[PDB]
Design a protein around this nucleic acid. Structure first.
Lengths: 135, 131
RNA sequence: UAAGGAACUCGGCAAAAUGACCCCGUAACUUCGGGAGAAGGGGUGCUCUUUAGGGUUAACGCCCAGAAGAGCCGCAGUGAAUAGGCCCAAGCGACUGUUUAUCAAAAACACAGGUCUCUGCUAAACCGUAAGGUGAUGUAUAGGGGCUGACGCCUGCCCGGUG
RNA sequence: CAUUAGCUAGUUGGUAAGGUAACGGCUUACCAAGGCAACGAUGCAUAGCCGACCUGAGAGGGUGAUCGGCCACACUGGAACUGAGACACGGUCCAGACUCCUACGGGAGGCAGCAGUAGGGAAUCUUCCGCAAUGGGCGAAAGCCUGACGGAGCAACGCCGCGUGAGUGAUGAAGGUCUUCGGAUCGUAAAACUCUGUUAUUAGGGAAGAACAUAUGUGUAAGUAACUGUGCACAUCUUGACGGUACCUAAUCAGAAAGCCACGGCUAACUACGUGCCAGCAGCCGCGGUAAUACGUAGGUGGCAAGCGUUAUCCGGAAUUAUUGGGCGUAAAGCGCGCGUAGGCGGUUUUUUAAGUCUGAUGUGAAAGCCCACGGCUCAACCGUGGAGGGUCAUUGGAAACUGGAAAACUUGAGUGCAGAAGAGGAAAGUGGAAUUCCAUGUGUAGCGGUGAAAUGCGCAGAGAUAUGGAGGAACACCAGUGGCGAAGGCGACUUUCUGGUCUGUAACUGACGCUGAUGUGCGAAAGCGUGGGGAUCAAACAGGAUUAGAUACCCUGGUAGUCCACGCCGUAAACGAUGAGUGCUAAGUGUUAGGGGGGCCCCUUAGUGCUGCAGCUAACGCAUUAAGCACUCCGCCUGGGGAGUACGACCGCAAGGUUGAAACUCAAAGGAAUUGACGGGGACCCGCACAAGCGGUGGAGCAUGUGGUUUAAUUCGAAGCAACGCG
RNA sequence: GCCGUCGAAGGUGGGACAAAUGAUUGGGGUGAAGUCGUAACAAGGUAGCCGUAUCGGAAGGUGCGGCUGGAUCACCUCCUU
């Protein structure tokens, strides 16, 4: 635009909508209010453990878990790895990162953490997927 | 309506130079007179002729071209525009094409070039870029 | 009339409660008029100080009203009589009005507004056996009859039958 | 944040009085009606502010941990007392909510001080030592207090530095992994000899931080009658939490000291095995369906390394808000068009001013930070010094070109005057001719009408046709054209009356009076609505009759609103040149409309309207003096596709509905131009036993054969449209 | 000691705003190659699109106005060589 049009109407940049919104909100049990926190991870309770069919191009039974976080927020989280020991009423640690196939899963359950075991036979890539150094 | 007579002058030179016209005429003004004589002394145009008519006399400019019809003037750019004026200090005077082109600066010492303007250590309005 | 306050009852029937004046506040909803006194709060006695106001005027004086203070007294000061209970929501009817004098006042009848139809003027329609009238000393923007019933949005399909 | 537009009533000013350290509606009376606001009053939400930190080439963008400056707060809320200073974190009174004691009448408490506990959370530490130094309070001082502070404890939380070994040594042992079975690779890697002690262990030394204060003496100065005493000058004595801690010196040992992630492309690093669209991987492109360098594992490789990855958030890359540094013909984007207000911008000359602009000088922009230099820790991190830098800064000189202000002057811009020109420009009222429909008659006889074929339908109660006449409504053939006029929408029969705009020529007048234009205010095709008229034709819808498998459609027959008029309302269109307005410049050629001047013709020229076409622009198509080129001013608009022009709110409207206008959620595309094919019930030209003329055959029966199916002990396996089925 | 001006907390009342929840009810998005038609892209079976109104199980069709972001065809009109 012209300089005068810019002076009257300064340029407005676009706002950035962030992924993993449920990690950006805290809770205050005393005031019954939601806060803004920007947490790396959040801890929740598994209210449902099951398996989800993936998007159309792919075909594989993917394990997931419905997790109610520390907030009053109920999200769906992926379970990386082969074997998992999670049933209902399991405390998990949930990080960011979505699954492309699974529609409605925007988070990942951290393996090898509070009440979540690692992958039994993992030998290369043990930082991810939990599990300690064999021998 | 007409808002920038100087920008009209540079565009007249730009348009005539593009089609390699040997000469052009434009309504004259004191500041437009000086810019023509700055371009003459800097070797961008051949000659400046100022003809006295009754009203706003005529400025005749004879453009210069080189051996293989090489347009001596490559481009013209109005810097200070009526919608947004540009003023520069002597310390931040711009160097057009690393000194291979002149910037027309109107200072308290008259309409001069950017090279010796740093010599007088004065600033003014950056009229146009000629390279 | 102790305490309770619709537990009575078919139903708050009856009774109780508000009520005057002054000041402040008043929502949804609306056809923009209203709703509305909506709701909901506060004051009113007496004496003194003070001192605006305009009314008749020659002025005294006579009337009728204001404001600010300082007191006084009772349980209570529109100290008696007279003077709206209110709010939320459904039907029904637009409304003011009129009806069974003497068991029914309403949701029934009117209504303003619509529509259909008839009627050309000795009009149609009506009272009379007729003469005479009404309509009207009116003339299709008038008159009679049917139906519906402010306003807003609308009013589908069927002409076999019957008129 | 405008989907927060009107906010206040001590409010705003004045006059008095009071009280405040002090001015002041600070408070109170009385006057007046004032005050702020699209330059965003008010309201809502959010937030301590800054030096500074992160990022970026810069412009910018994000942030406000530790350190320093300011502010505010001390369980929540009011108030004052003492005091120089408080309306007071470890002070007082009251109220409240809690927690505790009580002989029930009454009492006590406040870690957002340092530690520490419970709780919340993904997440953040010792209930330590000392006043040895620096600072603070009090005291003449010695001293006392100091959870300030100086130090220790814990945490890879970060930055920096050093390690975990080196020289020679077969890139051959033995072992893994592949293998083309020959070998290759781990690999100088390993033994193997020498070698060091950074580290570690033990066993001896062992700083600085210490300057003091006081006390003691010694002189000096001032004041002294004099002395004490005080200030100053000197030298003596003293003391350390850290701490026997840095650090150094001897022996001793390669011994006690590496892991994490990747290896499909972006992007450095490939093989084998397992699995087989499963298990699983994934930031995107995507991988995985018996031969994955993409999944899991094993070797090897590569990147880093006491760290390595993942997640969370910011900047960059992103020119993806484009001031630097983008666009709006077809990709997103020019408001449907005028009239116009604020604002923004503005023709030439002279004089002046100096607000901007430029150039100095002062004061300040604290310190700590960034950068540069220098010095000290063995280097570095770190520390300390000196510069530099940092402002829309304030005061004060100087310059006068430009922008701004003031005073003069000028016509080219813009307007007015005069002489001409054309026009379906608009409004009102009249006047016509052709045609359609209907009606009345005369003639007239069996059909009319319509389709691809029909039929519904109109007729025999005389239709259609033909002739005459009448009634009524609507529109104006020929003229008529890349013609004209209008801002756009739009405007065609003729006449008259009002009335708008435009063009040409002249140069008589004014001397910049101009452009654009948010809000605003008007106009604005059709359709639609209200009221009252009118109603010929055509007709949404509605009825039929057909076609189709169905046909609430195209075809036919009728037919209502509407189509017409007068008032209002509506305010939308592919309202398009899909192209904002103004100004100037930049090759040509050839038309047409309306004028002018020169020599029917030629030349020149002004304003429109067209078609080719240069430079130039564009992704291409294309535009091109009627730009989409080159420039300047102003406004409107856009920031991936859906959700969606949808909520919701507001405003407008009788209604239909119009304007403004999101989000949750979802995908990695959506889209423009052009290219190659393929498809067209999509046409023109040709060919072909394709059609026609045909002579001249099957599908009915019995048998044979091959199949399918059934059945069987098995009825062996293949062929399944043309191109399997008397096929192998 | 009394009372009186201000006065926190509290009480009463009518409004404003914001979240949550509510029988039931609307459109959207996704999915399993579920059923009826075939509306647009080829003149897409009847050019399309825009505005508008009225009807229809549904895409839509039709009525009026406008555009080419339409074929072929009959030719304009210029250009053109």
């Amino acid at each position: 635009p012209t300089i005068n049009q810019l002076v009257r109407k300064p340029r407005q940049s676009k706002i950035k909508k962030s992924d993993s919104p449920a990690l950006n909100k805290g809770f205050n049990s005393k005031k019954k209010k939601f806060t803004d926190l920007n947490s790396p991870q959040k801890r929740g309770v598994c209210t449902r453990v099951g398996t989800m069919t993936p998007k159309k191009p792919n075909s594989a039974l993917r394990k997931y878990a419905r997790v109610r976080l520390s907030n009053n927020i109920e999200i769906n989280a992926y379970i990386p790895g082969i074997g998992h020991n999670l049933q209902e009423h399991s405390v998990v640690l949930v990080r960011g990162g979505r699954v492309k196939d699974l529609p409605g899963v925007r988070y990942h359950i951290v393996r090898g953490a509070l009440d979540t075991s690692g992958v039994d036979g993992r030998r290369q890539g043990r930082s991810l997927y939990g599990t300690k150094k064999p021998k | 309506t007409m808002t920038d007579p100087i920008a009209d002058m540079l565009t007249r030179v730009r348009n005539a130079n593009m089609v390699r016209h040997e000469k052009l005429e434009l309504p004259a003004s004191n500041i437009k007179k000086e810019i023509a004589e700055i371009l003459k002394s800097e070797g961008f145009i051949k000659n400046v002729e100022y003809v006295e008519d009754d009203k706003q006399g005529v400025l005749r400019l004879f453009l210069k071209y080189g051996q293989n019809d090489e347009r001596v003037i490559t481009g013209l750019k109005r810097i200070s525009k009526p919608g947004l004026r540009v003023y520069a200090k002597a310390s931040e005077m711009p160097k057009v094409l690393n000194g291979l082109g002149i910037a027309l600066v109107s200072t308290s010492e008259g309409v001069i070039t950017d090279k010796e303007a740093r010599k007088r250590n004065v600033g003014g309005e950056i009229i146009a870029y000629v390279w």
